[PDB]
Enzyme design. Sequence first.
Site, PDB file in Angstrom:
ATOM      1  CG  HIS A  68      -2.181  -0.747   0.777  1.00 19.39           C
ATOM      2  ND1 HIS A  68      -2.186  -2.385   1.323  1.00 19.39           N
ATOM      3  CD2 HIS A  68      -3.291  -0.854   0.124  1.00 19.39           C
ATOM      4  CE1 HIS A  68      -3.263  -2.902   1.027  1.00 19.39           C
ATOM      5  NE2 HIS A  68      -4.012  -2.066   0.225  1.00 19.39           N
ATOM      6  CG  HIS A  72      -1.785   0.278  -4.537  1.00 20.38           C
ATOM      7  ND1 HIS A  72      -2.132  -0.828  -5.271  1.00 20.38           N
ATOM      8  CD2 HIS A  72      -2.572   0.956  -3.647  1.00 20.38           C
ATOM      9  CE1 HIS A  72      -3.614  -0.539  -4.971  1.00 20.38           C
ATOM     10  NE2 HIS A  72      -3.737   0.204  -4.008  1.00 20.38           N
ATOM     11  CG  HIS A 106      -7.013   4.494  -3.928  1.00 19.56           C
ATOM     12  ND1 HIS A 106      -5.807   4.468  -4.451  1.00 19.56           N
ATOM     13  CD2 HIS A 106      -7.133   2.994  -3.459  1.00 19.56           C
ATOM     14  CE1 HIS A 106      -5.143   3.074  -4.620  1.00 19.56           C
ATOM     15  NE2 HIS A 106      -6.017   2.458  -3.871  1.00 19.56           N
ATOM     16  CG  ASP A 107      -4.881   2.694  -0.521  1.00 23.22           C
ATOM     17  OD1 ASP A 107      -6.034   2.342   0.128  1.00 23.22           O
ATOM     18  OD2 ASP A 107      -4.776   1.738  -1.670  1.00 23.22           O
ATOM     19  CD  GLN A 269      -3.779 -14.393  -4.499  1.00 23.53           C
ATOM     20  OE1 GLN A 269      -3.673 -13.928  -5.466  1.00 23.53           O
ATOM     21  NE2 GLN A 269      -4.148 -13.979  -3.219  1.00 23.53           N
TER      22      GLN A 269
HETATM   23  O1  LIG Z   1      -4.849 -11.067  -3.538  1.00 25.82           O
HETATM   24  C1  LIG Z   1      -5.592 -10.544  -2.686  1.00 25.82           C
HETATM   25  C2  LIG Z   1      -6.077 -11.721  -1.668  1.00 25.82           C
HETATM   26  C3  LIG Z   1      -7.111 -10.964  -0.712  1.00 25.82           C
HETATM   27  N1  LIG Z   1      -7.313  -9.756  -0.947  1.00 25.82           N
HETATM   28  C4  LIG Z   1      -8.430  -9.306   0.235  1.00 25.82           C
HETATM   29  C5  LIG Z   1      -8.537  -8.084   0.472  1.00 25.82           C
HETATM   30  C6  LIG Z   1      -9.475  -7.653   1.516  1.00 25.82           C
HETATM   31  C7  LIG Z   1     -10.500  -8.224   1.728  1.00 25.82           C
HETATM   32  C8  LIG Z   1     -10.549  -9.524   1.327  1.00 25.82           C
HETATM   33  O2  LIG Z   1     -11.735 -10.342   1.659  1.00 25.82           O
HETATM   34  C9  LIG Z   1     -12.773 -10.225   1.066  1.00 25.82           C
HETATM   35  F1  LIG Z   1     -12.834 -10.729  -0.407  1.00 25.82           F
HETATM   36  F2  LIG Z   1     -13.691 -11.057   1.701  1.00 25.82           F
HETATM   37  F3  LIG Z   1     -13.170  -9.074   0.972  1.00 25.82           F
HETATM   38  C10 LIG Z   1      -9.582 -10.055   0.517  1.00 25.82           C
HETATM   39  N2  LIG Z   1      -7.248  -8.935  -1.895  1.00 25.82           N
HETATM   40  C11 LIG Z   1      -6.197  -9.314  -2.665  1.00 25.82           C
HETATM   41  C12 LIG Z   1      -5.974  -8.182  -3.519  1.00 25.82           C
HETATM   42  C13 LIG Z   1      -5.966  -8.376  -5.003  1.00 25.82           C
HETATM   43  C14 LIG Z   1      -5.649  -6.984  -5.477  1.00 25.82           C
HETATM   44  N3  LIG Z   1      -5.503  -6.103  -4.394  1.00 25.82           N
HETATM   45  N4  LIG Z   1      -5.819  -6.817  -3.405  1.00 25.82           N
HETATM   46  C15 LIG Z   1      -6.091  -6.348  -2.051  1.00 25.82           C
HETATM   47  C16 LIG Z   1      -5.123  -6.570  -1.036  1.00 25.82           C
HETATM   48  C17 LIG Z   1      -4.918  -6.073   0.218  1.00 25.82           C
HETATM   49  N5  LIG Z   1      -6.050  -5.130   0.473  1.00 25.82           N
HETATM   50  C18 LIG Z   1      -6.914  -4.587  -0.538  1.00 25.82           C
HETATM   51  C19 LIG Z   1      -7.812  -3.629  -0.167  1.00 25.82           C
HETATM   52  C20 LIG Z   1      -9.012  -3.567  -0.989  1.00 25.82           C
HETATM   53  C21 LIG Z   1      -8.782  -4.040  -2.529  1.00 25.82           C
HETATM   54  C22 LIG Z   1      -7.984  -4.891  -2.716  1.00 25.82           C
HETATM   55  C23 LIG Z   1      -6.937  -5.500  -1.722  1.00 25.82           C
HETATM   56 MG   LIG Z   2      -7.502   1.519   0.393  1.00 19.74          MG
HETATM   57 ZN   LIG Z   3      -5.673   0.602  -3.060  1.00 17.49          ZN
END
Ligand SMILES: O=c1ccn(-c2cccc(OC(F)(F)F)c2)nc1-c1ccnn1-c1ccnc2ccccc12
Ligand SMILES: [Mg+2]
Ligand SMILES: [Zn+2]
Length: 313
Positions: A68, A72, A106-107, A269
């Site tokens: 983050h 990003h 946004h972050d 994943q």
């Molecule tokens: O590879 C991943 C595996 C799990 N999650 C994830 C993140 C938050 C909640 C979550 O649980 C549920 F889905 F239930 F909500 C799953 N995100 C990714 C991911 C792929 C690309 N960005 N990204 C992100 C990684 C980290 N933080 C982020 C925040 C917001 C959007 C994207 C994020």
């Molecule tokens: Mg964010």
């Molecule tokens: Zn972001």
Amino acid sequence: GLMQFTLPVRLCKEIELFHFDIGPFENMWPGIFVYMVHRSCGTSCFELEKLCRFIMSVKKNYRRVPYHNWKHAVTVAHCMYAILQNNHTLFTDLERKGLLIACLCHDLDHRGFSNSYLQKFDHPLAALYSTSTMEQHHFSQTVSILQLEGHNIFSTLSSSEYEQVLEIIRKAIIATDLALYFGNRKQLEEMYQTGSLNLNNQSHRDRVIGLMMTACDLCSVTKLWPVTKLTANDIYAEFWAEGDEMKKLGIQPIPMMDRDKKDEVPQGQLGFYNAVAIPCYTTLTQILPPTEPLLKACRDNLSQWEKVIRGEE
Ligand SMILES: O=c1ccn(-c2cccc(OC(F)(F)F)c2)nc1-c1ccnn1-c1ccnc2ccccc12
Ligand SMILES: [Mg+2]
Ligand SMILES: [Zn+2]
Ligand SMILES: [Cl-]
């Protein structure tokens, strides 16, 4: 005014594609962002001196965390650039202005911790904002920077136009709260299927911009496999640090955040692509047909993760 920005030939061609990687040269990222603003919005919409000052203060307010971070911020802005360039006539002057700024900011001031961890730690930000805690903080940081001396990039807008673009930015940033995504995509899915979706209805525009913001935010899953696979390492470095901090609070973290359950990442994943990514880019392609390359690249990466599980890599 007659001072254009030009990239080397490979970057000039590749930056138009959805799967562009901005590279490891931090010092080129500001010039990449200004290039995208000039081509996406116009050379006249921001004062170069103010824009450069704004970009450098935003950069200063991103932290040294594995995922983050400033890289990003610029990556998410480049995905919004690709979407806007492939849907030329669909968006107003103000939306094009606001959406690239929203993606860059946004972050802002992220420390690598989820809204959940802030609530359990009992962080002050969780008392100030009960829902979308980090996302309201990111918008608050954006307003702070916009109010520094010589940093008002929107200075030539009327007060009412200024208020509209800050409201585009606020909604865009709040929409990156992934908890809000699930309901948003469901509603867009229904509106699209029953043919009620209407881009002249402002509340419908807001939802579509929300989904664009999810799509740009997740865009690491739409890169070529080597980029996607290496980005996953930075994502889970943050997850495992939060897992460690959960155990310090006396809480067993979910397996995604537990570094003892590293073996479960490939199936983790799969779940994320099936539950979040595929539906997101599927619904976005229905609404904005030219974003199809994002869905295609996402499916390609899902297929790569299945190969990992089956020991083909
Ligand atoms: O590879 C991943 C595996 C799990 N999650 C994830 C993140 C938050 C909640 C979550 O649980 C549920 F889905 F239930 F909500 C799953 N995100 C990714 C991911 C792929 C690309 N960005 N990204 C992100 C990684 C980290 N933080 C982020 C925040 C917001 C959007 C994207 C994020
Ligand atoms: Mg964010
Ligand atoms: Zn972001
Ligand atoms: Cl254009």
